[PDB]
Amino acid sequence: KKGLPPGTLVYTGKYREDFEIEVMNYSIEEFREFKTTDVESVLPFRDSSTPTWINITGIHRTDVVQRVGEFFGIHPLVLEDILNVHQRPKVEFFENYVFIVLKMFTELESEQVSLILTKNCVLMFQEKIGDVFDPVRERIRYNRGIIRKKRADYLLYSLIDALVDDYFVLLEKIDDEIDVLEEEPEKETVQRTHQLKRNLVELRKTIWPLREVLSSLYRDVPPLIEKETVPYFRDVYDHTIQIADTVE
């Protein structure tokens, strides 16, 4: 992107295998889900009276990103940031939507996930198939908790909460694997151990920009997040600050 001018829509990542769209539209009474490779079948949820989760996997299909973006009223410079997967997590507020860029860890792998909250949709953009959001899927499907009774702002909370819980499970799992490898002096074990330590180092770097995002979502929130949902965002934020540093 060094040569390219502002506004150039180019995917900068390494995943060009998968493409699918997955929709879950729900209310108190019912839910509906489907998978498709036909972008025209997701456009009508823009105007839905009930909350929709649209998940687009394979942003290498920049034609599909542009189609969805232009129909949903997403500014071209936001579409540029969705496709540019080499950037620091951040949150940006516009009049009709909230834009969030996060990292998702899932043989440790990173991908960028973008989320757009409108009054009735969460649009989620991913690089490759596989995510940490199955527990939210399961709550929609079997009507567990309160997600089916709430709006898209609570859907955003639920997705970010799943990501944050997974993050803290993951780095506990990495600490345990590292402790075991150290009880184990073969060349493969040593180089592997040093690999897992470098991985743990990159995991813990991402807490700082994530805390900036979580802070903005509960302190002077914009109108697309309702007063009643703010306490849920405050709980996700609070969960990141529990083992505080000490000066002594």
């Epitope: 829509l9 034609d63 500014h75 009049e95």
Partner: antibody, heavy 130, light 109 residues
Framework: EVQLVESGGGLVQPGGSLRLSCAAS????????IHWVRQAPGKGLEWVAS????????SYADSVKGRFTISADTSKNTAYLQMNSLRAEDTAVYYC???????????????????????WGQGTLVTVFN | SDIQMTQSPSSLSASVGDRVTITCRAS??????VAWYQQKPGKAPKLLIY???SLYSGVPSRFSGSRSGTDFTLTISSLQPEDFATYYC?????????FGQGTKVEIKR
């Protein structure tokens, strides 16, 4: 410095085809979004098609979708509208136009304006006949 | 599912020196993504105003635009002879792009 000049308008029959061209000078079409807008005799402005030239991404009004193809030749610096399956309601002055937007990146509240059409050619007349 | 832009009036009559007001109403929120264009007989449209209220380079300051929710107004503070013309509003928030019907500013007699 910036100029769009449309050409290629004339008589065309249903069954036939017509290619309109928009020659751009003072800027490179490669990094631009180019539009066709038409006006039927005594009527208003109607958007037809747009091309984001860097990716070749194209957009069409439902009234032309599947009949007209927009394209850009980034070595001639020229956009085209290829008109097929002509109908009497396609009779109109066709205008080419460039869009722009103003912005500043950064902060939690980025200053992002949506595009408008700064530069227009003087239009080319397409007359559909039996 | 296209956004409709309802422009009024289709025509109005005015004299030189009049304040003229032209309205456009979006069927849904288009944020501020509204532009205004002038067109004279036999000529291409010319941009006057973008993002509801930004005056385009070289356009006289007697043209102003404003917004209230989904209501958009073009104002000519003091009409001059060269301002008898057709005006169009356009939203660029959603694709497809949609134009108002137009307002013809005619000579009062």
């Amino acid at each position: 410095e910036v100029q769009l000049v449309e050409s290629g308008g004339g008589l065309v029959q249903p069954g036939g085809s017509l290619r309109l061209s928009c020659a751009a000078s003072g800027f490179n079409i490669y990094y631009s979004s180019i539009h066709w807008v038409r006006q039927a005799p005594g009527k208003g402005l109607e958007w037809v098609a747009s091309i984001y030239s860097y990716s070749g991404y194209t957009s069409y009004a439902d009234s032309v979708k599947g009949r007209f193809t927009i394209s850009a030749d980034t070595s001639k610096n020229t956009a085209y509208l290829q008109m097929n399956s002509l109908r009497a309601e396609d009779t109109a002055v066709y205008y080419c136009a460039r869009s722009f937007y103003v912005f500043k990146r950064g902060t939690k509240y980025p200053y992002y304006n949506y595009p408008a059409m700064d530069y227009w050619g003087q239009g080319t007349l397409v007359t559909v006949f039996n | 599912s296209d956004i409709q832009m309802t422009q009024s009036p289709s025509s109005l009559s005015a004299s030189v020196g009049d304040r003229v007001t032209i309205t456009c109403r979006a069927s849904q929120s288009v944020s501020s993504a509204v532009a205004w264009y002038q067109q004279k007989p036999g000529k291409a449209p010319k941009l006057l105003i973008y993002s509801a209220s930004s005056l385009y380079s070289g356009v006289p300051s007697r043209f102003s635009g404003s917004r209230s929710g989904t209501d958009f107004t073009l104002t000519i503070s003091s009409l001059q002879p060269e301002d008898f013309a057709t005006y169009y509003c356009q939203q660029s928030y959603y694709k497809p792009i949609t134009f108002g019907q137009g307002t013809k500013v005619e000579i009062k007699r």
